Design a protein around this nucleic acid. Structure first.
Ligand SMILES: [Mg+2]
Ligand SMILES: [Mg+2]
Ligand SMILES: [Mg+2]
Ligand SMILES: [Mg+2]
Ligand SMILES: [Mg+2]
Ligand SMILES: [Mg+2]
Ligand SMILES: [Mg+2]
Ligand SMILES: [Mg+2]
Ligand SMILES: [Mg+2]
Ligand SMILES: [Mg+2]
Ligand SMILES: [Mg+2]
Ligand SMILES: [Mg+2]
Ligand SMILES: [Mg+2]
Ligand SMILES: [Mg+2]
Ligand SMILES: [Mg+2]
Ligand SMILES: [Mg+2]
Ligand SMILES: [Mg+2]
Lengths: 147, 47, 121, 52, 186, 52, 125
RNA sequence: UAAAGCUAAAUAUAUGUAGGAGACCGAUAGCAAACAAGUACCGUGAGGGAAAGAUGAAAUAGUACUCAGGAAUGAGCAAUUAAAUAGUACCUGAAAUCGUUAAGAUGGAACGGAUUAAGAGAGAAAACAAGUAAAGAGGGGAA
RNA sequence: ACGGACCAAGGAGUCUAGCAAAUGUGCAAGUGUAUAUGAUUCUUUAAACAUUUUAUACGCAUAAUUAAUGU
């Protein structure tokens, strides 16, 4: 809203806040990203260090749907269950839950965190990591591969 | 807490109903005014 | 439980259909609401904020007596037709048990002032 | 020169809209607030005012 | 004349008043200013100050860290001037008593199912006027992402600051100035 | 009466607003001067002091 | 100079007129602050126009009182002057410029019955 | 399953024509043009291109008569209108610039800041008198 | 040293895209009902209201690192 703009405070002043000696002129240093590597070098180097040059191989026709893969850690793995359902399994001891994470939108199980001690759980997925699968085995569970 | 139901002649009380729980919302004039300023822009015509 | 006297004061400090301020002669601001004995814009004199109140007003030609005295949201607006000093004194005992003496002489003086106003036809 | 691609309207979150409507119904049930908006209701009995 | 610095006038630096126009918050500020003044307890002063700070200095606190902080303070009350959030990484919750400004629906439900209670600040002002057996806590104030861009500029030796980039990949700012293979690293 | 169904006090298909929760307050009771005058608070105050 | 009547003190009575407004007629007398190098008024040369400052301010206890020693209130109809029945010794009334004679007669007659003074009760007679 | 062919809908519309509308402009603004406007006028030619709205309710009230004067025009005891200092160049009618009368100043500029004095013009809302008593003229309230 | 014989009207940091910091508001491991469709919406309304009768549209966030197979 034009009511609150800064320029209205300079309305009786001569130079509109831009200076007697250095004016407000039009493009006194170039246009856009003009002078990089010549007279804008310091800015480019201290704020965007790796900007110039190229590195790596080409990939000519990508097709990103071939490698799409969302992940989930073992922490959030008991939290997919309702709390009253989580209560029942921790009470009884000869039953365990079987969870299929692909039905929830995850493809690869990943292994950060701590599973509950002596509480078996069976997990279905497309890919597993080594540490995640070890942690699932240690508490008495099992991993299953699906496609 | 209840409310009375008045007949269309304006004098008799012909029942009562229990006050709905929507009537306990916090009254917030700042929020109402701010939401109103944005919403009232949607019916303007261009020039 | 979503409202109190203090919250009602917070909502009606500035935006209100009874407030009047004078652009010229910068001193002063008034509340002209029906149950304001004075006309101060303070939480301790405004009829909308207080839970019990009494007042005397003209409102049409004659003089009218008003009571609020609503203590469980039973907002009751009793209006009585003041006639003379003795009747007003009787009504103050009848309905104004919650007032101090200090407020009662102020209301009586206000009534004595209001009784001197008249017009034609 | 004024143009037709000035942003004429705004988008408002749904939850805030609903919150404001709810807070505006609640204010309709306080006698003091209704009076201060300019309505002459010195002769009403109840401010919620339900009718058959 | 006379040789003073800042013409003898004392300087202060923080926030002085509320910016928010919420009437309930203004009622709270009035109440706790009164309590701090008439019972100078160093508990009411800090509270009266904290509920004026801007949003970035009232961070959320999760349930797991709340329980961890109160592990050696049974039958005490925790006081927070932010919001409490749920944590799906916890398996079980104890019985706790907590006062704060806001609770999320899931956290509020989980707290009450274990036998605890939630309080607002006008209830703690009424039952604990001087904060006896109350423990003040706050969440992380330097975990926001904006803070990862502050500090030494990215380009000085051994700086941890993130850069502002269009996107992320091998083609976006990784060649000259980021590896010894192109004229120098960092 | 429809106003209790609209906001989920009683549930009904195609009338109740889906998964909407009625908002909550940061103050339990906005009467601060009733809190100040209570005995518990009044017994913790300090004697009134003098101006200059 | 300083003018003092009772307890009311005015620190200055002359106005502040705009620099060079006596020499050019396109320059109006209303005060504007001089900006611009080499002015001789911005630089406080002796012998020229003075600038207004916060020092000339009035005592807070007597800031808006008229020589009547009361405050002024402007009314537009009979009903607007209701609040003056409680504070009739600290206020005086003035009638608005665009009210008719018929309305003015009523306003004056009520103001007399309330024991409040009217500043301009001689207009349109 | 190439080197032959056909096909509606969902899409676009600074043109032409008709209809509706706006937190738009208000006669130096808005289209160049609110009016005999792509007109008057300029250029050998391709082309360039303005200025210019308002008496009053009604003129089915637009100024009859007399005197002076060659006329134009002026004046009236004469005349329309609520109004002519609304008379057709007609609502209101600012500033620059000029006329008339009055009051002042005036030895190679004039205005000005501070402070007083001498003149001239206006002014009673603080810049005196509640109340009592006898009439006279009004206007309200209650039992 | 340059502009200024006088008066009236006009006359100059704005709009859109994209990013960030600050602050206010809502919800919170989530958040934002896209294009559409529905309705006993239809002067206003080109607004407002709704969401498909153990619930996989899409964006940003919830995980990094490497030229890369990948982990
Ligand atoms: Mg400056
Ligand atoms: Mg310049
Ligand atoms: Mg230079
Ligand atoms: Mg000094
Ligand atoms: Mg002055
Ligand atoms: Mg200089
Ligand atoms: Mg073919
Ligand atoms: Mg074809
Ligand atoms: Mg039109
Ligand atoms: Mg034009
Ligand atoms: Mg007339
Ligand atoms: Mg006219
Ligand atoms: Mg000479
Ligand atoms: Mg030059
Ligand atoms: Mg020149
Ligand atoms: Mg102008
Ligand atoms: Mg922000």
């Amino acid at each position: 809203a034009t009511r609150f703009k800064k320029n209205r405070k300079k309305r009786g002043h001569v130079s509109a806040g831009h200076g007697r000696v250095g004016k407000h002129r039009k493009h006194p240093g170039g246009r856009g990203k003009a002078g990089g590597l010549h007279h804008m070098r310091i800015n480019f180097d201290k704020y965007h260090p790796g900007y110039f040059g190229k590195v790596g191989m080409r990939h000519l026709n990508l097709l990103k749907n071939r490698t799409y893969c969302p992940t989930i850690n073992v922490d959030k793995l008991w939290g997919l269950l309702p709390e009253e359902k989580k209560k029942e399994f921790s009470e009884n001891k000869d039953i365990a839950p079987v969870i299929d994470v692909t039905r929830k939108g995850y493809f690869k199980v990943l292994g950060n965190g701590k599973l509950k001690h002596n509480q078996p759980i069976v997990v279905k997925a497309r890919y597993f990591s080594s540490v995640a699968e070890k942690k699932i085995k240690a508490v008495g569970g099992q991993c299953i591969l699906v496609a | 807490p209840v409310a009375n139901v008045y007949s269309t002649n304006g004098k008799n009380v012909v029942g009562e109903v229990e006050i709905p729980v929507v009537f306990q919302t916090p009254i917030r004039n700042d929020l109402i005014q701010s939401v109103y300023t944005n919403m009232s822009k949607n019916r303007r015509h261009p020039y | 439980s979503n409202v109190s006297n203090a919250l009602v004061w917070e909502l009606t400090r500035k935006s209100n259909c009874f407030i009047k301020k004078n652009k010229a002669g910068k001193k002063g601001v008034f509340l002209c609401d029906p149950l304001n004995v004075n006309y101060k814009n303070t939480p301790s004199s405004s009829g909308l904020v207080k839970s019990n109140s009494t007042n005397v007003t003209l409102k049409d030609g004659k003089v009218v007596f008003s009571v609020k005295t609503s203590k469980e949201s039973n907002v009751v607006n009793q209006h009585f037709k003041a006639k003379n000093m003795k009747n007003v004194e009787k009504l103050l005992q009848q309905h104004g048990s919650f007032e101090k003496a200090k407020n009662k002489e102020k209301l009586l003086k206000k009534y004595k002032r209001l009784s001197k106003l008249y017009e034609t036809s | 020169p004024t143009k037709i691609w000035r942003r004429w309207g705004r988008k408002v979150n749904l939850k805030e809209k609903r919150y404001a409507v709810c807070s505006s119904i609640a204010a309709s049930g306080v006698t003091s607030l209704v009076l201060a908006r300019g309505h002459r209701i010195s002769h009403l009995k109840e401010v919620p005012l339900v009718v058959s | 004349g006379i040789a003073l610095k800042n013409v003898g006038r004392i300087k202060k630096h923080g926030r002085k008043h509320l910016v928010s126009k919420n009437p309930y918050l203004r009622l709270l500020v009035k109440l706790y200013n009164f309590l701090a003044r008439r019972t100078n307890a160093n508990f009411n002063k800090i509270i009266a100050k904290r509920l004026i700070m801007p949003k970035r200095y009232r961070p959320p606190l999760s349930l797991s860290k709340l329980q961890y902080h109160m592990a050696n303070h049974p039958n005490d009350i925790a006081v927070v001037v932010g919001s409490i959030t749920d944590d799906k990484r916890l398996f079980s919750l104890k019985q706790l008593k907590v006062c704060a400004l806001r609770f999320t629906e899931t956290a509020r439900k989980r707290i009450e199912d274990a036998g605890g209670e939630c309080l607002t600040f006008d209830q703690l002002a009424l039952k604990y006027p001087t904060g006896k057996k109350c423990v003040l806590l706050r969440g992380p104030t330097k975990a926001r992402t904006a803070e990862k861009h502050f500090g030494k500029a990215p380009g000085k030796p051994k700086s941890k600051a993130r850069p502002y980039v269009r996107s992320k990949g091998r083609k976006f700012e990784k060649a000259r100035g980021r590896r010894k293979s192109r004229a120098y690293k960092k | 009466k429809k106003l209790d169904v609209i906001y989920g006090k009683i549930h009904e298909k195609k009338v109740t607003k889906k998964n909407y929760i009625l908002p909550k307050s940061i103050v339990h009771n906005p009467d601060i001067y009733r809190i100040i005058h209570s005995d518990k608070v009044q017994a913790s105050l300090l004697a009134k002091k003098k101006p200059c | 100079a300083v003018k003092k009547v009772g307890k009311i003190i005015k620190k200055r009575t002359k106005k502040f007129t705009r620099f060079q407004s006596n020499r050019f007629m396109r320059v109006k007398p209303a005060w504007r602050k001089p900006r611009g190098i080499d002015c001789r008024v911005r630089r406080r040369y002796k012998g020229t126009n003075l600038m207004p400052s916060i020092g000339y301010g009035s005592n807070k206890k007597t800031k808006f009182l008229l020589p009547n020693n009361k405050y002024k209130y402007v009314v537009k109809n009979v009903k607007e002057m209701e609040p003056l029945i409680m504070n009739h010794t600290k206020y005086c009334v003035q009638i608005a410029h665009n009210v008719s004679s018929k309305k003015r007669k009523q306003i004056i007659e009520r103001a007399k019955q309330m024991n409040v003074s009217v500043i301009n009760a001689k207009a349109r007679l």
